[PDB]
A paper describes a structure:
Hit optimization of the scaffold represented by compounds 1 and 3 was guided by crystal structures of these inhibitors bound to [name]. As their common hydantoin scaffold showed excellent hydrogen-bonding complementarity to the active site, this chemotype was maintained. Variations in the S1 and S2 pockets were explored systematically in several cycles to identify the optimal combination of substituents. Combining the spiro-indanyl moiety of compound 3 with a pyridine in the S1 pocket (compound 13) did not improve the potency compared to the virtual screening hit, but the predicted binding mode of this inhibitor was supported by crystallography.
Numbering used by the authors:
A (entry chain AAA), B (entry chain AAA): 1 to 305
Amino acid sequence: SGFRKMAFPSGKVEGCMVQVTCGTTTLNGLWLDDVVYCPRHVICTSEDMLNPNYEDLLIRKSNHNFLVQAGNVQLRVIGHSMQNCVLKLKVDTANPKTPKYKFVRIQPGQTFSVLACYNGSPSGVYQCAMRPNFTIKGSFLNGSCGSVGFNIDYDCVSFCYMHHMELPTGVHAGTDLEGNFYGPFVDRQTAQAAGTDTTITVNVLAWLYAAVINGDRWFLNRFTTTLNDFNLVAMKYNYEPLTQDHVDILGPLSAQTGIAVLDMCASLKELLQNGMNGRTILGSALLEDEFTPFDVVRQCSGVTF
Amino acid sequence: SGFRKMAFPSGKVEGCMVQVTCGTTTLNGLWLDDVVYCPRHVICTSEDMLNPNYEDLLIRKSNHNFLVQAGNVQLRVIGHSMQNCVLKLKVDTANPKTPKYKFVRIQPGQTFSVLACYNGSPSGVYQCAMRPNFTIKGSFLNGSCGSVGFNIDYDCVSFCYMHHMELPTGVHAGTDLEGNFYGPFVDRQTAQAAGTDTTITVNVLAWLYAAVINGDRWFLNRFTTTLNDFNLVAMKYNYEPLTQDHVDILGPLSAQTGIAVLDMCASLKELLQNGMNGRTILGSALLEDEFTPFDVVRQCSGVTF
Ligand SMILES: O=C1N[C@]2(CCc3ccccc32)C(=O)N1c1cncc(F)c1
Ligand SMILES: O=C1N[C@]2(CCc3ccccc32)C(=O)N1c1cncc(F)c1
């Protein structure tokens, strides 16, 4: 027992990280088969960043201007393309450490692990959620661009995020691996509105199920609610509306625990309206929304990769 | 910027995990050079666990009774020894994936990453602290025994923890890699007192420095305190007493931020006495004690491995 914010083991991703340098800019790239993926802003200088003309900047570059190094080994670049906000550098050697992988574009409210890297070298791994407003709340310093987010299922890494930018508000934005930003963001040094975020209701409920499974149960009550009444409360407290598709995804946890989804909703309603009264749940003094129902089931059943 | 509970990248450890089976018991082992380390309780059955005579149990076993499998490859066991609460199985092949490593016995209040594994296969990685009472608050299911905790410095993995037991209270206990338990615990199915825990004061202060560095600063105040006055407050609130050695370890963060250690203590005093008043710090609604001052500096400066 116990319940922790757990990241996927990072080794399969560590073997894919490289350093990419173009002129004076160094950031991270991802080497899969004979292609390295990295943020296109590797080609800018500081004069460029307020509104770069990436097509003109890239026309000034040739294959030999992209320095790609995998630990101590230098890769030979034999082609370059820009796809949306990523560059794709074709190299003459397939990465021998390429895992089975896919590129996925995740939905808001889903979670993934981030392998934070600098200069091509891994620093740390942590779990986090794509916010409803398509930002992430990560830990990224200058040099972390090109660090990636991923999930693993069996032996297959699904890459879902590449880090590009810190907004002036301190939150993070990035792309899928086809270079399309999550959210309205653009790769330029401007203030950019993220727009209203909400709490991920289905994930809070999953975490309360994890709490009961672990024996933290003080917040269960004698009450029930309806999906309509709960959603009135959700709106007042800037929670995502709960839908029947959400109720259905919580089915396994409801079955495991015997606590009907709408009964758990009535526990959550009371927590929203009354607070935690100075108490904690699974070590937290707030309602946690970065565990999906699948996360909870996986951790509670010890699934491996 | 941003600040997250970050684990070390786990790849160097993933390459060392194996499954060890003795009779009907399967748990995890750690294969370094030509030795596999695992909990000695792999040799017990359920009849044994209330008070096993490990010396008699191990005398009934021979090399060929220890089944060791590294993914799909079977290892040949050519010797076996018990050291304290660990078994050491000598194998005929050195692990080709052995990293540079050391065995360390950590101090209470220090942190490390855990690679949770089942049947020799990694499940997830998370960070956590050795509590002052020598327990850890992990996420471990049946089958996780033999999972290890570690830190990495440059290219060198320091293994500090091997998981053995969940206490009836739901918290976790284990050994160093020489098989000596942290704390008063024994490897038998009995209720066992952990004794009084406290909050790790030097780590709370480091985290408040991390918060200021990140711009969460609402808790800074106009006050100062003395080490003696602060320690009176620490005692009332079951915090570890702060010593000058602690003040000295916080030196770099004090220098970085310009906030004297005793001034940060006066912020902490006010938080202990008044609470957080419904506010958060670095996403948390409680005072966080699982980041060491070294953790904070590393994460704030993007150190890699
Ligand atoms: O390295 C850079 N470069 C920036 C400057 C502003 C900018 C605009 C477009 C693209 C990239 C960049 C940026 O946001 N980051 C950064 C990322 N994460 C964490 C950080 F601390 C900094
Ligand atoms: O696998 C086992 N086996 C136990 C039973 C009781 C016991 C006593 C001595 C040694 C070992 C064991 C034990 O504590 N765990 C366990 C560990 N972590 C998380 C869990 F959920 C269970």
